[PDB]
Design a protein around this ligand. Sequence first.
Ligand SMILES: Nc1nc2c(c(=O)[nH]1)N[C@H]1C(S)=C(S)[C@@H](COP(=O)(O)OP(=O)(O)OC[C@H]3O[C@@H](n4cnc5c(=O)[nH]c(N)nc54)[C@H](O)[C@@H]3O)O[C@H]1N2
Ligand SMILES: Nc1nc2c(c(=O)[nH]1)N[C@H]1C(S)=C(S)[C@@H](COP(=O)(O)OP(=O)(O)OC[C@H]3O[C@@H](n4cnc5c(=O)[nH]c(N)nc54)[C@H](O)[C@@H]3O)O[C@H]1N2
Ligand code: SF4
Ligand code: SF4
Ligand code: SF4
Ligand code: SF4
Ligand SMILES: [S]
Ligand SMILES: [W+6]
Lengths: 963, 214
Amino acid sequence: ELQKLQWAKQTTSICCYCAVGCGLIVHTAKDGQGRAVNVEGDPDHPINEGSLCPKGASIFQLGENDQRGTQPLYRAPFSDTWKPVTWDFALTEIAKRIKKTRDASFTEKNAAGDLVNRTEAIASFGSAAMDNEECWAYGNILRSLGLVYIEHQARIXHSPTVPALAESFGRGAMTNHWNDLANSDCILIMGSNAAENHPIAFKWVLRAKDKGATLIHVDPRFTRTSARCDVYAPIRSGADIPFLGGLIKYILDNKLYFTDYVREYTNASLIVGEKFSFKDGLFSGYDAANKKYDKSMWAFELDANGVPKRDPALKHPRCVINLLKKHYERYNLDKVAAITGTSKEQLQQVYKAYAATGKPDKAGTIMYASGWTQHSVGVQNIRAMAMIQLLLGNIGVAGGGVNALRGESNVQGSTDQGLLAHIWPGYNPVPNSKAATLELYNAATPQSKDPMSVNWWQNRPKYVASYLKALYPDEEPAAAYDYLPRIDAGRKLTDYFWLNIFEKMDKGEFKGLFAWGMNPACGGANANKNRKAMGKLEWLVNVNLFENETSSFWKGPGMNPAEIGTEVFFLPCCVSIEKEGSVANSGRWMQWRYRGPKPYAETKPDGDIMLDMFKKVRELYAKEGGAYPAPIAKLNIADWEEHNEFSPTKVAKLMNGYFLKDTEVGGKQFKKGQQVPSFAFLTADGSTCSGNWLHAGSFTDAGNLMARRDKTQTPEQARIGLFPNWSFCWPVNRRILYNRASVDKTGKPWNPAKAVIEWKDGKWVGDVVDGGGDPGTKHPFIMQTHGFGALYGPGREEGPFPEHYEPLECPVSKNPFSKQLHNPVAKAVCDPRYPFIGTTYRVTEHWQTGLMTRRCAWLVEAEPQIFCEISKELAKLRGIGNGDTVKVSSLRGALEAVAIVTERIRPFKIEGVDVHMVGLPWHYGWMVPKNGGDTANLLTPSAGDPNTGIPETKAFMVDVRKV
Amino acid sequence: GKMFFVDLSRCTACRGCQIACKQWKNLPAEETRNTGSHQNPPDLSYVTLKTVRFTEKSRKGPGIDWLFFPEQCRHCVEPPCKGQADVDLEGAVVKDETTGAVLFTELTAKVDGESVRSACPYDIPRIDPVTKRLSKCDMCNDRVQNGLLPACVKTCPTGTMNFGDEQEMLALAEKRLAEVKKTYPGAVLGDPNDVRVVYLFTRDPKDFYEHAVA
Ligand SMILES: Nc1nc2c(c(=O)[nH]1)N[C@H]1C(S)=C(S)[C@@H](COP(=O)(O)OP(=O)(O)OC[C@H]3O[C@@H](n4cnc5c(=O)[nH]c(N)nc54)[C@H](O)[C@@H]3O)O[C@H]1N2
Ligand SMILES: Nc1nc2c(c(=O)[nH]1)N[C@H]1C(S)=C(S)[C@@H](COP(=O)(O)OP(=O)(O)OC[C@H]3O[C@@H](n4cnc5c(=O)[nH]c(N)nc54)[C@H](O)[C@@H]3O)O[C@H]1N2
Ligand code: SF4
Ligand code: SF4
Ligand code: SF4
Ligand code: SF4
Ligand SMILES: [S]
Ligand SMILES: [W+6]
């Protein structure tokens, strides 16, 4: 044996960084009773096969770290010092700050006299870094206290992904999964630096190449990804719509679209109403006054039943397909080349290679992330890519899909648990003030008269009921419905989102903030505004692993602690390897992980911190009363607990759900207390509970399916890497979404060599079929109202077809595709002292704001200091030498970085003028390490796209000067 | 004996290998600054047995040739460091004949440091300024002895790092070289008859590092 590991207990875990979800092995001394002695890859894990990037590889140094929090700290108004403090104290004083603020600010009924039962004095940030069970319980705790201002990581990046992909396919999620990349014939990486930001993905990307795949990187910069692709094509910031629109025109003009797929499975054949038109860059029904569209002008023509009329011939001039051909005629190579900066030769090379996946025997995939999602055009970029994938028949097939790469380890799960202002768990909307009853709430769910449209969302009442019977199992759903808070029907939805929360805080409209596993002081655009804004808080509960820029904002650069009266409780949580629970990766794999070492010092799992904190609110309300006590006292937290502490296993079983009494569902008999085996057997009549209908199937009577570590595969499964017995994915272990689209009318795969599903002996064999039914009987997009992949999306605010509107406000003055220059639906100063396009991005070695990785000496070793990446041309123009200190400045702030001069940045030709892009990592912060530098968000603008609610972190004007 | 096949045509410079090496041996970190490069630490040292070197080389058309070199002891079949060390004290530098590992022992404190380094045609050996012992990649010899891949090999996601019996690994190097030449015509193995760490360079090895080959 090896001495290092000899008497250490071996446990499995999942990486606590990016959404690839790599397996770990943890060795814990004294046979589990000591500290972790080693952390490395799990050789048996089917995604990483034992490999780890430097972040996963250094998890030992994150866990066994003497800079970590040991016990609760407290900071008193106007103080300049932390005060060590007990847990019992911290959570007693926390509960009192909650109740005081709640009572003072609770609104039983809004101004229009409608029931809302909410608190608008308290906000919550986080967290994508928490376990699924902790996310679910956290959300329920905040809503029971009447919060509506509940946001996390998912708002900043993939807020655009969910609407864009939901409009397109009926779900917001990554359609395929990591292993499935190896089945692709052409991988387009665009708005993604996957070799750095999802590094283990490149195991599968390079295996695709091994089997004949072409790898294409479309990026403003040459990166570590670019180095290992067959084609690197530069594109200037925010020129993706022109690029993708030119690919649409190419595919259509050249008949490269997969006609049978497009005819049956997309809305190509649906007839649009005569009121639809487009001219001078505007769609029909434009309201110039308010800068918004009358979307009813876009409505389909309906037959006698109210079903959208169709021409399967695809000949009617108001056929989606023919309007599509018309709309994208303008996107010729010369115009696209001129605006993208991409050579005509390179555009043709890329269009030819990717459009070749229109063949049934070829699969094309797109990998994007924050290069698309952190632009104002994000939603239309993604719509366009979704439309290209539908034209090429790439949706539902192995090596196909839209691989919207999730960021944080459990951002998928934290979204699934409804830690965003607009959703409950399972993407059931948070009720608005006009949804006065449960019955009215369920009335908003749209029905379909089409017999072939599964329209699965009609099952919503069973999910909302079962969700209310998980929170309040003694109450009737209809009564329980009144306990949960409601948003104002009148108010713009984004008023409840991350952007406005900081705006409001800076007006002092918030007394309390939960910074729960986030670093707002570094994470938020315009850090100077946000660090000043946090002063105007009365109290702040920061739960994290380390002291950080957020917990200690009061002693930050140019801050005077004596002036700042904010009360601050720093509560230290334990690392991922010190707790049991599940995380949902980008592919929707819900993976169970175990405790190695027990929590360091007096650190606690987030589960225990929030439950204990809640119980102290709960008991304090039972002795003192106060504003609307009901929801707090009635909330079922017994199901969350075992042996006096938070039970991941029991929360996960409640999230799956169980029968509250004997019930017959789908013609089968089910006993009381027994586990719901899938969301198909949930009810609206109170017979079932389920914390999350997506989780129904994840923890059955058969056991914890998320904990399965079984590589058993049939030949057809193993051929495309489904691994259906390793962990569990929502929904009901469907590994590739929309997989009904991968077969014809008879249930024969388009591509037998890479079959997802196949009709064999009256059954679907391979993946779990995405929608029940015999071949040819159902439209394949079961979560869509109408059942089709949407080329034409009449619910999108900017129009049913993506259209180029310029995201770069300053250096551009001409839209070559219309008279409409900027987004006609959405005030940047463009001060001539800041001529360069600043952009922010990541390196492989660091994580997010760097709170975690700036505390790991091996990652700081590799990337010790903030840098500024500039072209040779900019360096020469500004007299900067490689390694020189430089001042980067904007209207919002200034910082010093070391200059990295490189041919990996090139100037962009914008209207016969050279425009210089300036690259910065946003991984640094004043706290640690010494001489690391501060957040790049000193430089970024606060406001942004008012539709999605996202700041402009990818294109912001800066100057750079030698020091 | 054992061999590494290192396919640099697959390397994403993720530096999983750099961190894995330090985690497995619990080596400390150097004090580093950024001087205009992602490369850090800038060089091998007593506490750094492997660093990924980054060189940017111009090409025609868009982008650059970005050349990544995860540097380590080559575990030479006939190691000059041993012959130069044996001059002062036999035993200081040993050869594990089962694995092929060239291993520095605690007795390198007695031998001349600079001498043993100059004799290395890859400029690998590094001397602790205070204790005057020599350190370098030890092939994770104890892991290999216990039937485990070396840390840097197991951690590597791309398929750059490969390890096994020198017969299978030479056969892999050959077969991979023929395939990789199709996209990188200037692809060559580094001194494939002299070393147990056989790098496939996508071009002239000296473009990757001055001492990439003897
Ligand atoms: N190492 C590491 N990995 C991470 C993270 C981390 O901090 N470090 N964070 C995780 C999180 S939270 C997320 S959301 C993901 C994000 O992952 P990515 O989106 O890959 O992250 P970035 O590095 O911000 O930028 C992606 C690329 O977009 C390019 N880009 C910028 N503007 C444009 C544009 O207008 N068009 C196009 N086509 N490309 C553009 C940039 O040049 C960059 O190469 O990464 C996750 N993984
Ligand atoms: N300029 C610029 N700004 C950006 C971005 C950008 O690309 N450019 N990216 C944006 C994006 S995509 C995102 S997601 C946000 C991220 O912004 P934040 O989420 O605030 O970033 P961090 O706090 O650095 O990263 C996640 C946090 O989770 C904490 N954590 C880890 N494990 C646990 C645990 O068990 N419990 C708790 N409670 N906390 C834990 C870590 O310590 C860390 O503080 O930043 C956004 N900001
Ligand atoms: S950060 Fe992502 S790629 Fe790296 S080890 Fe963790 S999960 Fe795997
Ligand atoms: S782990 Fe593999 S891909 Fe990453 S830098 Fe090392 S050799 Fe290159
Ligand atoms: S073989 Fe072992 S000692 Fe050598 S570089 Fe790899 S991990 Fe480090
Ligand atoms: S590479 Fe240098 S240190 Fe390593 S065995 Fe050869 S001569 Fe000795
Ligand atoms: S994220
Ligand atoms: W993110």
